[PDB]
């Protein structure tokens, strides 16, 4: 018999992104080659099969630094991290291959799906 | 020029609620009289003006335990904490006064609004 506030989930995500921008309560640095990205472990787990696996691990859950595979593109990661916190994906011709490869590695199935559909339309 | 995934914010919130149920990465206990509630500080701040103020405070941000005013009803808090993590509000005749008082204290304006409208319809 509950009532539901339609905009609540979007409002929560907007405030989690505000916390990220101000670097409040971030508890991990994701290292992608020469670049560093601060984030909240809980948001990363909620969006990515890879981070969900990493941060449920009894040893890795306590790490303050996570280094990604050297093949991972920093811009691709940046675009996906922005997507995690906003629901918006900056998908462009010049970045689509890097975004799709990063989304496959991060296990973000909905992003992989759309990247596949956008590439198929161009061939 | 971004594209947007409509269900993303709801999917994030569902996984944050799963983390809460499994007690993963919870970093605070909220004490309401004889009852204890584990939560994520980031979610509490994102939903409540009171917790936003508390956890941006340079001293209170590091506390593992927060005690609420003894006038706060544990059931009212439980209903609001469930709302924070799900967008669903279990608003009933028997709990509406406690929910509205708790929402005013927690500074959850949208919940206060609706409680006011539901009470006005019954008078």
């Amino acid at each position: 018999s509950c009532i539901q506030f339609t905009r609540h989930a979007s409002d929560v995500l907007l405030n989690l992104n505000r916390l990220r921008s101000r670097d409040i309560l971030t508890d991990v640095v994701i290292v992608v080659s020469r670049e560093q990205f601060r984030a909240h472990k809980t948001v990363l787990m909620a969006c990515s099969g890879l981070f969900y696996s990493i941060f449920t691990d009894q040893l890795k859950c306590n790490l303050s630094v996570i280094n990604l595979d050297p093949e991972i593109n920093p811009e691709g990661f940046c675009i996906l991290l922005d997507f995690m916190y906003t629901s918006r994906l900056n998908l462009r011709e010049g970045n689509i291959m890097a975004v799709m490869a990063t989304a496959m590695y991060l296990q973000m199935e909905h992003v992989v799906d759309t990247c596949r559909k956008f590439i198929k339309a161009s061939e | 020029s971004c594209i947007q995934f409509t269900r993303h914010a709801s999917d994030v919130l569902l996984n944050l609620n799963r983390l809460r149920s499994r007690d993963i990465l919870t970093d605070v206990v909220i004490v309401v009289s004889r009852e204890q509630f584990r939560a994520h500080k980031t979610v509490l701040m994102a939903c409540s003006g009171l917790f936003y103020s508390i956890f941006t405070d340079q001293l209170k941000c590091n506390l593992s335990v927060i005690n609420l005013d003894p006038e706060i009803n544990p059931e009212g808090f439980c209903i609001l904490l469930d709302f924070m993590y799900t967008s669903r509000l279990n608003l009933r005749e028997g709990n509406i006064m406690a929910v509205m008082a708790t929402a005013m204290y927690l500074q959850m304006e949208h919940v206060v609004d609706t409680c006011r409208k539901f009470i006005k319809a019954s008078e």
Binding site: Q4, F5, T6 | -
Partner: peptide, 4 residues
């Protein structure tokens, strides 16, 4: 607010 809606009836879900």
């Amino acid at each position: 607010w809606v009836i879900p």
